Design a protein around this nucleic acid. Structure first.
Ligand SMILES: [Ca+2]
Ligand SMILES: [Ca+2]
Ligand SMILES: [Ca+2]
Length: 290
DNA sequence: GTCTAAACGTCGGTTAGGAGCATTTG
DNA sequence: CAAATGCTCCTAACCGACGTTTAGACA
């Protein structure tokens, strides 16, 4: 069984809050307004969604070109809210959530059927995710975007949150470099990684303090948390994710990752035929895993 | 001269986010 | 019959996952 913080952490990575405002002629406002909450994963990670439903006791799972669990009902969205209020987000999506929560209560109270409540909802959508389209902009000119809370001073609520957040945005891979300076031909190192936009770089920084290791890398928008020191990986990272489990197919990737780590710890990455075995593990991992 | 750690670099798709018709409900 | 909800298609970037070079401690 999963942990609630694991769900929150994963949701901080892969979930989404939405407000759909489309034109409906058969409505008295001329507009339809509906709130959504959805998580979209690759087909191979359906069981993640399933484990979430078993905990929350709500949601609709579907599998086509991708796997989704959606909450589009009032009863369903209440379950989502009751969970995220007891176990709050700490990324920038918390801002997206609070705006979502407010719009939710406007709809539960039928206030969205008034034009005043309608306009108010669009002020919330304007500050939600990507904001308003050009079509909605022309339909609702000079709409004042609601104030968006800037999430700062976010401290780690639980170790399970990290396990969840890494199970979504994280990555366990090995690096094989072509370095002639090494005897066995190549250089081998295990790498732990978390990727995120710079808008939550403050969260990435105090994530290092919580894990007591790692470096921050800025690409050529996005920000990465990288761990390469085998000392940290062997004693700090692996025991952490052994207590705080990784969910999904990624778990199978973490196990092979850990299996490679110990091969490096015993210097089998310096023998050419122990290296070939390490490589044989790699192509069965991640993008190679069929 | 070995090998580690980390800085630097790059592809492509699984994510995040979206809009709207079709069906049920009360 | 109108509001809520179920259901189905659409879009691309912030991701995941892969590579090479450089600044050094061991010697
Ligand atoms: Ca994310
Ligand atoms: Ca993911
Ligand atoms: Ca992601």
């Amino acid at each position: 069984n999963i942990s609630p913080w694991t769900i929150t952490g994963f949701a901080d990575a892969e979930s989404s809050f939405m407000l759909t405002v489309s034109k409906d002629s058969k409505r008295n406002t001329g507009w339809s307004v509906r709130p959504r909450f959805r998580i979209g994963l690759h087909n191979k990670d359906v069981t993640i969604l399933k484990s979430i439903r078993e905990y929350l006791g709500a949601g609709i799972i579907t599998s086509d070109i991708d796997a989704r669990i959606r909450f589009e009902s009032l009863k369903e969205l209440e379950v989502v809210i009751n969970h995220f209020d007891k176990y709050p987000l700490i990324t920038q999506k918390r801002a997206d959530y609070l705006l979502f929560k407010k719009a939710f209560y406007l709809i539960k109270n039928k206030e969205h059927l008034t034009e005043e409540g309608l306009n108010q909802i669009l002020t919330l959508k304007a500050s939600l995710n990507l904001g308003l389209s050009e079509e909605l902009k022309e339909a609702f000119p000079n709409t004042i975007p609601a104030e968006r809370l800037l999430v700062t001073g976010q401290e780690i609520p639980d170790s399970n949150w990290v396990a969840g957040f890494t199970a979504g945005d994280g990555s366990f891979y090995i690096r094989i470099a072509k370095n002639s300076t090494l005897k066995t031909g190549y250089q081998v190192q295990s790498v732990f990684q978390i990727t995120q936009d710079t808008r939550d770089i403050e969260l990435m920084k105090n994530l290092i303090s919580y894990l007591n290791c790692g470096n921050i890398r800025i690409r050529k928008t996005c920000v990465d948390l990288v761990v390469t020191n085998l000392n940290d990986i062997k004693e700090k990272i692996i025991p952490f994710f052994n207590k705080n489990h990784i969910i999904g197919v990624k778990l199978q990737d973490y196990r092979d990752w850990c299996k490679v780590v110990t091969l490096i710890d015993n210097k089998e990455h310096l023998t050419s035929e122990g290296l070939e075995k390490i490589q044989k593990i790699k192509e069965g991992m991640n993008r190679g895993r069929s």
